Symmetry: C2
Subunit: 106 residues, 2 copies
């Protein structure tokens, strides 16, 4: 766990490995992706940072006791899941914030 | 840099230390705060996590090559700043995402 600038990485999630296939009927898993990568001080353009992230990035370069801005997901999307609630009812719900579309520094 | 659950920490930022007092007339600095703290697998309630964060937290507990959800700011607020643009014009602008109100796992 350590690499260049903040970016999106591939990550398929199998519901059976995380023990969710018990309640999630479908899909069996999904391409979720994830974010990772240092948020540099010279602030990459392409990479987006909130004003706070920028302020913190700068402070960090003049004082290291303060952490750099983290590389988290900034753009997400949803996926459908057919599952069974606590009462064994079959539900088809559209779950938000499941897939990482874009990454950024925050 | 290493502590318990994700939480907000105090952080005053002096524009002179980060070399911004040159263009920012006022204020001289401000209480920005910052976020830090591990995002545990048993997922603290009070602490908020996106669906993705939850999925990633879980994966992480069954595979460590994948990073835990990061502790970033989830609720921010703005502050006013009187500054001078590139043309030496005095501007009073309300800058968004400057202050960390709440923290979370993403």
């Amino acid at each position: 766990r350590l690499k260049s600038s903040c970016k999106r990485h591939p990550l398929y999630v199998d519901f059976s490995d995380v023990g969710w296939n018990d309640w999630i009927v479908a899909p069996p898993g999904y391409h979720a992706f994830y974010c990772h990568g240092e948020c540099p001080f010279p602030l990459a353009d392409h990479l987006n940072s909130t004003n706070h992230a920028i302020v913190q990035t700068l402070v960090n370069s003049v004082n290291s006791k303060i952490p750099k801005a983290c590389c988290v997901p900034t753009e997400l999307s949803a996926i459908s899941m057919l599952y069974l609630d606590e009462n064994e009812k079959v539900v088809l719900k559209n779950y938000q914030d499941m897939v990482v579309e874009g990454c950024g520094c925050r």
